[PDB]
Amino acid sequence: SGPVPSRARVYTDVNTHRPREYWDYESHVVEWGNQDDYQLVRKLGRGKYSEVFEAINITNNEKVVVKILKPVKKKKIKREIKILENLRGGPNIITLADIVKDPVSRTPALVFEHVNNTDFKQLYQTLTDYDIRFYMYEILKALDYCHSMGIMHRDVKPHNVMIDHEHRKLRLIDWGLAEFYHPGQEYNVRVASRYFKGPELLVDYQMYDYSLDMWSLGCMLASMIFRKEPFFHGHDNYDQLVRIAKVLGTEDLYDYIDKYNIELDPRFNDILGRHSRKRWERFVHSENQHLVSPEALDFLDKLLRYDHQSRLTAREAMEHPYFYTVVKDQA
Template identity: 25%
Template structure:
């Protein structure tokens, strides 16, 4: 889009920004508005003097590009939130799969952050057409970014397609928007002495406490049981003050109110977030990755559209069954009951996520919403064979309406075709393994980003030595003068 094509109201916004931020016009040429969220607006701009693009050139996907993203953070954001986001971005500058904070300016209550501009494609434009190899690369890039972020002890808390900018043509992605990110607290269970009931009581009164982090210790005994209320009855008791909760309501409530960070986007929140677990970890991001992968395999987006936490749990019930949700609730000291609702079974889909994805794809194949060339037919054929043709020990090519294979496996290209099909089948098998590891309800059993990267699904990328190391940026070779200027980024007060 040329500057002439930019709407008048956007031009007025950019002109106002020039007036609000003294000196901005000399450093950056504002070109267009490219995004707007709850807490910020983002503009595409050109780095006039090239200082930022040269210093952080390894982060720019297009060699020699001077385009940057200028993020205006609204004054309605709390100072602590702004400081938190900018400081975390600065801490994460060392990885090319995480958007770095290149520059920051504050004039009174106006805060501007400068990041590289990434020429990406909208998720909605490619999620139905990405082949299994493309899904593999998308996931590889995302997990590499999260592995780095989590290694710093940081939870992103809002993993979703719009916060992972991906270019399917070059197979590169970058994680953005750390406005909801925070450091993971240290849940050190060793701090509690094994035989100290007083210490246990003190720990349980902590705001971040959740029974899920002590379930595998020896503390779950008669002297320190946990609370789970089911069918209106107290099944377990973690009331350290000794109030009998089975005899009505106590006059003075002594139970700790369950508080937890519920930041994130509906449809992508992990079960422990929905259940207000106060001991959340980086594993909440892995669940969100699983939701994205489920959308890519089923070619449905958005997949979950509930308006509140209760409906979100019911959506999960339709797939996994209420028995698994109840078991998950018990981990967090909660009860879970469902009654009077049709189509909710105890165990969900008999063949789990594979059957759920097959049902969604089969519906579209039946009504003919996929074009003839759709890559989704590969996944549908794999699942049809995996679930309903157990006698087969090798992949079969999709068949035409006459019942004959659609492609001839004989002749000079037969071997290559057969090899390709077997590789696609293998990719699908391991991809669903990764999906199940991501959508594990118990966060302690859910795989980490670094563990998922070692999955057989990514063998070809690991063996091909696709760059995995944290790349050093030109920031390390800055002059002392540049370093002094750059250090100012940390001086935005909270």
């Protein structure tokens, strides 16, 4: 027998109730502007499927960010465009300004509003325990918005969070792997980055949903408050689960697998072994104890769960006592 089906416990039928053209991105018509409106200034970074430059708009002389798309199925370009168009103006989501094709190369590129990245080396030694609570709240704002809009990000990881520390602005970026939730759909499990892949991805369980984003978010929190990056440091995808099982124990993992009737690769059938679920205090030490609190350890533990039904939702997470202080200051 095959796996047990699963449904998201919030925002389940949000896409069912919308007009079709909301989520049916394969038929979306995109009008491609001219990239020579823009002049590339300097590289900002480079992903596996993008290449980000700061540019100026030689018409209104404005800063702007141009992301050249790498050669991917037309489909997935329309999807990222559709999702960005669907989320424009939402809290802490990046803002799409234009969509262009270079005249000669004919390579597609997305054009976004300008943001400044804070010296990523600054963040290490400046981030107070409160600062983590704040920028984590901002991230849950963006995830709750987009889950309410029927979209999962599927690539939540620090290289996809823009922070402007001077102005305390955060933007969630790279929507190239984002996808619409449709109850009962089976999604590709070759998504996210290793260190942030949720258990459901490593065991190939295809009816995942928004809670995938809450696992990854738990990995960031894990790596922030313990100053251990990445927190589950896997040599490959099979090993990654073993790194997780050494922390979360195997008894819960094998419960997870029996509850969903997952069949397990014969590869796994000897590398996982037996492991107790470790206590979070094992990971505290003199140089991270100022970011670790009983509240943070409760909050973190309520995200890193095998069973995806039982992870917090973005909305429940923003209600955790971890965030009491920052909610107070927002008035």
